[PDB]
Amino acid sequence: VRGMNTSSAMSAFERMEEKVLMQESRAQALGELAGGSDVD
Amino acid sequence: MGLFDRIKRVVSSNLNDLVNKAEDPEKMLEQAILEMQEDLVQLRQGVAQAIAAQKRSEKQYNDAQNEINKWQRNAQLALQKGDENLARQALERKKTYTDTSAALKASLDTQSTQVETLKRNLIQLESKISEAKTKKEMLKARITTAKAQEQLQGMVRGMNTSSAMSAFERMEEKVLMQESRAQALGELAGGSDVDDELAAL
Amino acid sequence: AQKRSEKQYNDAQNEINKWQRNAQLALQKGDENLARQALERKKTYTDTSAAL
Numbered sequence: 001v002r003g004m005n006t007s008s009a010m011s012a013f014e015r016m017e018e019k020v021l022m023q024e025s026r027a028q029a030l031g032e033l034a035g036g037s038d039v040d
Numbered sequence: 041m042g043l044f045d046r047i048k049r050v051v052s053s054n055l056n057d058l059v060n061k062a063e064d065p066e067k068m069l070e071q072a073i074l075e076m077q078e079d080l081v082q083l084r085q086g087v088a089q090a091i092a093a094q095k096r097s098e099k100q101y102n103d104a105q106n107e108i109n110k111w112q113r114n115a116q117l118a119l120q121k122g123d124e125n126l127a128r129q130a131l132e133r134k135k136t137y138t139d140t141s142a143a144l145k146a147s148l149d150t151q152s153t154q155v156e157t158l159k160r161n162l163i164q165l166e167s168k169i170s171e172a173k174t175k176k177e178m179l180k181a182r183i184t185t186a187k188a189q190e191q192l193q194g195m196v197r198g199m200n201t202s203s204a205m206s207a208f209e210r211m212e213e214k215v216l217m218q219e220s221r222a223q224a225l226g227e228l229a230g231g232s233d234v235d236d237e238l239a240a241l
Numbered sequence: 242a243q244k245r246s247e248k249q250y251n252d253a254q255n256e257i258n259k260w261q262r263n264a265q266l267a268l269q270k271g272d273e274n275l276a277r278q279a280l281e282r283k284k285t286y287t288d289t290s291a292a293l
Binding site for chain 2 (some may be wrong): 008009015017020023024027030031034
């Protein structure tokens, strides 16, 4: 399960998952920072 | 609080951050999956032993049941050949087998329930490992999305995250400066009249 | 980090309405027991929403 750390394998898996999500969030924020009615 | 506790907390907080920098997602995801599967394999064998023990218990139950009828047949053979002595003695002994049959079936039932629960758990674990194996590919897709978006931002004029854009903009500015030099040199050393025709037509 | 925090806020807000709907489903099918228990738990989510 996501929220418990009894197993080392899940610990590592979730840690890498969070690292990658953070990296993508960094990319998105950098996108924002530097910068359908009509077709409806 | 203490002092040795504090020193060891500092040393640990340094070593852990040293390690967490070496971890690389693309490889540790696979390593986690590999160990996941190893553990599942080692659980299969426990389930197998449970099943084998159930087979043994049912076989014992069947054999006791068969001996019950065997001794009933022995009683009938006594009735055919012998007398009431052997005929009654056969059932006298058959008492024990009738007892043991139920005494064993009671536990055989619980054993069966346990084996069923174990099989269910094994299937659940297989499903969850498959889900994780899909999540790994989804995470790789996210990595690619991140790198693509970072590529796009490097294309904007005012930021220097990408070396290619750095060089491109540098040459652009150099050339604009050269043209400006030419224009200034032009200035340094050195439409009302034709708008009248617009009145003609 | 701000994006993450707002997403958590939104999810807690959504779960508040989810458990309200569960209470209504209890009212439709179940009885006062489940209907009241849904809001009993919803207390925590209402707390966390503001705390976040």
